[PDB]
Scaffold this active site. Structure first.
Site, PDB file in Angstrom:
ATOM      1  N   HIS A 125      49.194  24.980  29.027  1.00 44.21           N
ATOM      2  CA  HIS A 125      48.067  25.694  28.441  1.00 44.21           C
ATOM      3  C   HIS A 125      47.887  25.375  26.950  1.00 44.21           C
ATOM      4  O   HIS A 125      48.853  25.351  26.195  1.00 44.21           O
ATOM      5  CB  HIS A 125      48.284  27.204  28.628  1.00 44.21           C
ATOM      6  CG  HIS A 125      48.213  27.657  30.055  1.00 44.21           C
ATOM      7  ND1 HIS A 125      47.945  28.963  30.411  1.00 44.21           N
ATOM      8  CD2 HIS A 125      48.347  26.972  31.217  1.00 44.21           C
ATOM      9  CE1 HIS A 125      47.936  29.065  31.729  1.00 44.21           C
ATOM     10  NE2 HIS A 125      48.172  27.870  32.243  1.00 44.21           N
ATOM     11  N   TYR A 156      36.094  33.724  26.838  1.00 45.22           N
ATOM     12  CA  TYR A 156      34.890  33.827  27.661  1.00 45.22           C
ATOM     13  C   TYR A 156      33.771  34.553  26.963  1.00 45.22           C
ATOM     14  O   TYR A 156      33.160  35.449  27.538  1.00 45.22           O
ATOM     15  CB  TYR A 156      35.189  34.479  29.001  1.00 45.22           C
ATOM     16  CG  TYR A 156      36.301  33.772  29.745  1.00 45.22           C
ATOM     17  CD1 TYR A 156      36.063  32.558  30.385  1.00 45.22           C
ATOM     18  CD2 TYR A 156      37.597  34.304  29.785  1.00 45.22           C
ATOM     19  CE1 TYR A 156      37.072  31.888  31.055  1.00 45.22           C
ATOM     20  CE2 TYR A 156      38.613  33.648  30.457  1.00 45.22           C
ATOM     21  CZ  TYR A 156      38.346  32.441  31.095  1.00 45.22           C
ATOM     22  OH  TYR A 156      39.347  31.770  31.777  1.00 45.22           O
ATOM     23  N   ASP A 201      39.491  26.507  33.316  1.00 42.94           N
ATOM     24  CA  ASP A 201      39.564  27.629  34.239  1.00 42.94           C
ATOM     25  C   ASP A 201      38.428  28.610  33.999  1.00 42.94           C
ATOM     26  O   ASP A 201      38.456  29.330  33.020  1.00 42.94           O
ATOM     27  CB  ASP A 201      40.908  28.348  34.027  1.00 42.94           C
ATOM     28  CG  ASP A 201      41.268  29.303  35.171  1.00 42.94           C
ATOM     29  OD1 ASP A 201      40.391  29.677  35.977  1.00 42.94           O
ATOM     30  OD2 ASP A 201      42.451  29.691  35.264  1.00 42.94           O
ATOM     31  N   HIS A 203      37.779  31.170  35.861  1.00 39.17           N
ATOM     32  CA  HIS A 203      38.402  32.474  36.094  1.00 39.17           C
ATOM     33  C   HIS A 203      37.396  33.515  36.602  1.00 39.17           C
ATOM     34  O   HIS A 203      37.388  34.644  36.111  1.00 39.17           O
ATOM     35  CB  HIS A 203      39.047  32.978  34.803  1.00 39.17           C
ATOM     36  CG  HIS A 203      40.283  33.794  35.012  1.00 39.17           C
ATOM     37  ND1 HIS A 203      40.253  35.094  35.470  1.00 39.17           N
ATOM     38  CD2 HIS A 203      41.588  33.508  34.784  1.00 39.17           C
ATOM     39  CE1 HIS A 203      41.484  35.570  35.525  1.00 39.17           C
ATOM     40  NE2 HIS A 203      42.314  34.627  35.118  1.00 39.17           N
ATOM     41  N   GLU A 227      38.611  25.148  37.840  1.00 40.17           N
ATOM     42  CA  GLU A 227      39.377  26.137  38.575  1.00 40.17           C
ATOM     43  C   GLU A 227      38.642  27.453  38.727  1.00 40.17           C
ATOM     44  O   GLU A 227      37.990  27.927  37.798  1.00 40.17           O
ATOM     45  CB  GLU A 227      40.673  26.416  37.802  1.00 40.17           C
ATOM     46  CG  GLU A 227      41.491  27.541  38.403  1.00 40.17           C
ATOM     47  CD  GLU A 227      42.855  27.684  37.751  1.00 40.17           C
ATOM     48  OE1 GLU A 227      43.233  26.792  36.951  1.00 40.17           O
ATOM     49  OE2 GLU A 227      43.546  28.692  38.042  1.00 40.17           O
ATOM     50  N   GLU A 253      44.412  31.159  43.410  1.00 41.05           N
ATOM     51  CA  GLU A 253      45.496  31.948  42.822  1.00 41.05           C
ATOM     52  C   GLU A 253      45.405  33.396  43.275  1.00 41.05           C
ATOM     53  O   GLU A 253      46.447  34.043  43.467  1.00 41.05           O
ATOM     54  CB  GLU A 253      45.523  31.829  41.298  1.00 41.05           C
ATOM     55  CG  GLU A 253      44.430  32.572  40.559  1.00 41.05           C
ATOM     56  CD  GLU A 253      44.500  32.319  39.053  1.00 41.05           C
ATOM     57  OE1 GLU A 253      44.687  31.145  38.652  1.00 41.05           O
ATOM     58  OE2 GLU A 253      44.353  33.286  38.275  1.00 41.05           O
ATOM     59  N   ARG A 274      45.484  26.699  45.038  1.00 40.32           N
ATOM     60  CA  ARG A 274      46.155  27.237  43.856  1.00 40.32           C
ATOM     61  C   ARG A 274      46.965  28.488  44.139  1.00 40.32           C
ATOM     62  O   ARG A 274      47.285  29.251  43.221  1.00 40.32           O
ATOM     63  CB  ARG A 274      45.118  27.630  42.801  1.00 40.32           C
ATOM     64  CG  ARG A 274      44.393  26.452  42.159  1.00 40.32           C
ATOM     65  CD  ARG A 274      45.213  25.921  41.015  1.00 40.32           C
ATOM     66  NE  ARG A 274      45.271  26.869  39.908  1.00 40.32           N
ATOM     67  CZ  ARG A 274      46.332  27.062  39.129  1.00 40.32           C
ATOM     68  NH1 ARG A 274      47.470  26.396  39.345  1.00 40.32           N
ATOM     69  NH2 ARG A 274      46.264  27.953  38.148  1.00 40.32           N
ATOM     70  N   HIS A 303      50.113  28.211  41.663  1.00 40.26           N
ATOM     71  CA  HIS A 303      50.009  29.021  40.462  1.00 40.26           C
ATOM     72  C   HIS A 303      51.333  29.061  39.697  1.00 40.26           C
ATOM     73  O   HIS A 303      52.362  29.405  40.276  1.00 40.26           O
ATOM     74  CB  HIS A 303      49.583  30.443  40.838  1.00 40.26           C
ATOM     75  CG  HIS A 303      48.986  31.216  39.706  1.00 40.26           C
ATOM     76  ND1 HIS A 303      49.158  32.578  39.561  1.00 40.26           N
ATOM     77  CD2 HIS A 303      48.219  30.820  38.663  1.00 40.26           C
ATOM     78  CE1 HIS A 303      48.520  32.986  38.481  1.00 40.26           C
ATOM     79  NE2 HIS A 303      47.950  31.938  37.910  1.00 40.26           N
TER      80      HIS A 303
END
Ligand SMILES: [Cl-]
Ligand SMILES: [Cl-]
Ligand SMILES: [Cl-]
Ligand SMILES: [Mg+2]
Ligand SMILES: [Mg+2]
Ligand SMILES: [Mg+2]
Ligand SMILES: [Mg+2]
Lengths: 395, 395, 396, 395
Positions: A125, A156, A201, A203, A227, A253, A274, A303
């Protein structure tokens, strides 16, 4: 003659994150197994599920019947297929696998087919408040030898004005975020080039058609994968996404149910799965999912966040080592405390993890030291996400 | 330091059927593997494939890398996916699993998930010139403890008058056959009642719409399964059959290619998959197929004819013992000579097979007694089947 | 009362590559047929299939019943549909067609419908370590009159990823580096050679399905004649997704051995060119059926024409090419003098066209005495042991 | 250099039915071909199409390029795909295969694959005013050796009362007809058993859903096939029928367009393809259709009524001999005049046809004798079919 005698939960947080580890003890002195049961947000409910139900279910059973135990345990309460129950299954199923490796004098990955690769490629990350700080992290990671990185900027869109009074929550702006991502990858690729692999990601933070536009717009930047473009509840939207975009997709995930992942994989709606291994019920169902994925040309990307004990990190990596359709391994670097509480963590060396060749999962836990890091508990704040008008969102 | 040092093939016909068995030897005392490569009609070409290509491919490699070896061996000749090549793969693959079991001091079924059942239910064959003699064989087998039996009458119409001169072949009449079957089963159910489970094998002998009509007409007689209603070349016709019939269907003994079985299993077009394990490449791909079937609710019914060695029989049964979606095991009773040449044959007791708990596949071959039964060779007459007008047909 | 009297394999390697040819002899003195059974990586197993099985199956039988023989031989072992078994079929099958043409006094293409074109356009391979070497080779082939060329730069990436600290032996490549590199290559070629020349690129199953889809989309502006093998046979279901998004023509099939591989592709318009190795699908009889099935679906033929096919198989490719309305292109690998001497009757190559002679049957012979002077090397090729950077065994 | 020098049409009616045959002559001694262009209800237009258009198109071209000529002629007038156009194309194409056979010294069937069977099983027509005269005709044919018969009764109902006025036409009653058919077959099966094979022709006479019910009601009577349950304009209704019925279906005598048959065959919507060889364009396209059918498991049943010349009968049968997927051959007995005008008629013996082994199609025409049987011409009455209310219908 060989029998399970006791099943206990160990709650500990050496890396600052609450973990739950299951120890399965047998009537052979010194022979035990460990598994990961980390559903960090509900650890006290996992402990309860293990202590009240799994323990009396398992005592006195033969631990080598891993599949019979998995099948009968999974249906023991009738209702099934959920994260807390799946993690109680995973703590046990990983511990039995671990015991089986010990009885065989072999790592779990030798049981599952043997080495398919010489090292396990990792991604890590890299965060930043802006384009320049993100690049700085990517640069720091590249020097350590990572050849893959996940790039997020900000939180975000954490931009539209809210109404005159706001209900408490962590506010984000989905449309602001969605427009900023392309600008981020334009910058990164211009700065760093195309040698380094990028993951981003989403998310589950934007509406499905916003996710489709993002996938399309990122095609020039050649992500390793995008992702979580949709929530599990919106997986039907991937039919439309995959008619239009060629950006690689990962999902899973959050998955806790075959009816979530089977249709995606059957229809080639994703490129990487994932799943959080413990959250689908452990090594036995993860191996099955890996094989299902393989035959459909889909690769694995288990994950690998901070909220997974080193026992689960070994689990992922044993699966990785033995899977022909391995894709990549997310990795969250550990501190000294974690390595001391859990002797046997895999060696990390220049963007690759090297698992040891000790029997079972090759991992131990020091119960005494574990007690020195009691669990925090508490409600996480970040799961209370609101869009600018104050609407509670899937986080 | 562990290495494969020798790979050899043994051809032997103790039961009167040409068998091929592969022995894999290593540099550790007492550590070797056996696997089945029996494709009885092309046994001399399988020997050539093993001796000329597999053996030099394997010498000097680490036998614990079963998956890596399987993947790389299967693509070693570029072209692949065929019965000779698959049997060569299997001979090695089952032998490597046998070796892994011995290293771990465990039966292969213990490596594959442990025992899922207390024994393996079997079905055997019962033939006859008529409804009367078939019923006599069924009684004999019911006395021995069989609770599932495969019923055929005659050889598929072996009736329309043929043309004035006939090209050599084994003549049958597909239409006379198809009409006669429902009468066979009406008689058997009246005689024997609905307690015993019945299997019937169409063996690709009729046109597809004829098989659909047959499947519909046999519904009242409740077969355990109706086998091979279509040739692998006609699998798309199962879409129609399954919109119309509720008779359970098995397919797959002829299958050598994933594009043959994956569409059928993906669309719930069969209830039992019948692959001949060595012909799909051994335990490794067979386990994956069992798992693939499992996630789709399809059960296994591995091919267990006379043309499989006792080693392949043991592989079937180790898959059978560790599969939660096990369906049934076809079984061909062995003679004294087979048990003498292959020490360790599963025990057969009142319609169940009981595998031994000996490490690996629990099976061996006495190379000296095997030599007392050289292979016959030659081409079987039965694969030259002709319909009444002389047309060469899929047997 | 014509009968087959003997069936034998000839294994020779006059061009440095191991070939298997089948000779079918009859009780009519001087009347025989030749067929290609070249599965080069497994020729000794092919030889065994023919010698131990095809021979006794066929001796004594009427060679003119091509279809009957093909159908009955194909299922003679019960199990069927695979590369070694199809090649034994093919050796016999092409040899029977060869005999039929000799009995009819006609080339095989005349029995299959007669000439549909006046010559057979070819493509040749142009390789190179870098963009400029590829381009130089292209210019050299254009000068010889080639109008279609397959362009590969390097070996599928073998800025590459760093591998782990020990490597298991194998031929290492890097699919992501390769993938990035292909569009750059075609942008250069088109800027330097323009659009008159037709370009073919072979992905050769080296990348994940979504990577190949991206590749197909990115290459659209360069207008390839076709992009070949974007996916492995095991992954053909991924072509549904690729064909919803890309308009780059696709070819598939050199690896195919089973109808359940190609029938769904062609039925659903998932490819534009079928690439089967004719001997590997069982000879002229099944190849002709495939060509017809293709035609009715608007799909064209591009039969595999590598170095590892005998001149008899090359003639087969070309008699099929001459008689198909849906012919697309013919890959051609130039022969050396030894091939021409061992197999008199090789088709004439002239300014990117091939011109088959008009002699009966396949119009090709074999000098068995000369053939013996080029014994088969055998062995395992190194190239099929392909590994990605982390060490994973890959489909080559 | 071999060239076509002349192309003429011969109209003759030795059997009472207008026939058209094309003769293509070349500049080699004794080398000419015959073919069938028989669209009997439009013969005069077919002669015009051949004489005004095909003949000048062909003169001076090499007759051995059968496929080039077919492809180029088919598109010579731009618009294409119709019964008259196709028939003119057939006449030339069959003639050219005939020429190729004579050049080769071989029967056309030898050019197309060699013998695939030892003779050709036939079915014939047996009509009757009522269920008992039909039976009598069946017994008669069975004595002559036919093992397959087509069973019709009366004239498709030719019962509701019509309006007080009636427009001229041949009146029928489809609803009365549909209800009579299952009763016919129950009676016939009761009397003749299930040895004999039965065919029934619905001939596009009922609505689609009515044909589906018919197809289901006849299932117990086990027809060889039920023919033309829908009109070409209604083929989409077969999708529904094949979801419900297991009665074998044949279709296609009316087909003139690839977009008619290709969908039925790809989707397994029929079992037998029934095309009129000359009406789809001759031997070249029929052989492609036979191969498309074979790859889909569909069998041939070429149209073999009275309106086909013995040249077309010969072409059907050369296709029949070289087809692995041959199904059945409809046959209409010829009279002495047909056999005199066309030397080389197939020998008919106990329900099989045996084609001669002469080169090409093995058939010829006595032009002087043909001239003694001029074509009547005219418009048939039967194609003016009306339902009780007066509605003009597909006949
Ligand atoms: Cl629980
Ligand atoms: Cl063979
Ligand atoms: Cl016309
Ligand atoms: Mg995530
Ligand atoms: Mg069977
Ligand atoms: Mg290629
Ligand atoms: Mg009709």
């Amino acid at each position: 003659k060989l029998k399970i005698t006791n099943v206990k939960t160990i709650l500990t947080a050496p890396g600052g994150i609450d973990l739950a580890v299951v120890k399965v003890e047998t009537n052979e002195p010194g022979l035990y197994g460990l598994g990961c049961a980390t559903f960090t947000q509900r650890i006290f409910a996992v402990k309860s599920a293990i202590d009240e139900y799994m323990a009396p279910f398992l005592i006195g059973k033969d631990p080598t019947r891993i599949e019979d135990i998995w099948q009968s345990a999974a249906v023991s309460g009738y209702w099934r297929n959920g994260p807390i129950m799946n993690n109680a299954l995973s703590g046990v199923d990983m511990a039995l696998w671990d015991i089986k490796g010990k009885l065989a004098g072999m790592p779990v990955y030798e049981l599952l087919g043997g080495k398919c690769r010489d090292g396990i490629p990792l991604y890590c990350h890299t965060d930043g408040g802006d384009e320049v700080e993100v690049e700085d992290n990517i640069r720091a990671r590249m020097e350590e030898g990572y050849q893959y990185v996940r790039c997020q900027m900000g939180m975000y869109g954490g931009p539209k004005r809210s109404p005159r009074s706001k209900t408490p929550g962590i506010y984000f702006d989905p449309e602001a975020y969605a427009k900023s991502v392309p600008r981020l990858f334009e910058h990164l690729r211009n700065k760093l080039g195309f040698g380094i692999e990028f993951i981003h990601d989403v998310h589950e933070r934007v509406t499905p058609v916003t996710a489709i536009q993002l996938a399309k717009t990122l095609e020039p930047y050649q992500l390793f994968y995008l992702e979580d473009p949709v929530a599990p509840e919106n997986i039907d939207w991937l039919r439309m996404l995959r008619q239009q975009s060629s950006t690689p997709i990962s999902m899973g995930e959050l998955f806790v149910n075959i009816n979530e992942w089977k249709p995606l994989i059957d229809n080639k709606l994703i490129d990487y799965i994932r799943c959080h291994v413990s959250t689908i019920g452990g090594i036995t169902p993860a191996k099955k999912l890996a094989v299902y994925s393989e035959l459909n040309g889909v690769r694995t990307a288990w994950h690998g966040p901070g909220d997974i004990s080193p026992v689960g990190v070994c689990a992922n990596m044993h699966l990785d080592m033995s899977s022909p359709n391995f894709g990549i391994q997310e990795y969250t670097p550990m501190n000294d405390a974690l390595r001391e509480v859990f002797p046997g963590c895999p060696e990390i060396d220049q963007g690759y993890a090297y698992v040891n060749d000790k029997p079972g999962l090759g991992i131990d836990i020091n119960e005494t030291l574990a007690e020195k890091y009691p669990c925090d508990g508490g409600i996480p704040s970040w799961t209370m996400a609101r869009t600018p008008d104050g609407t509670a969102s899937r986080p």
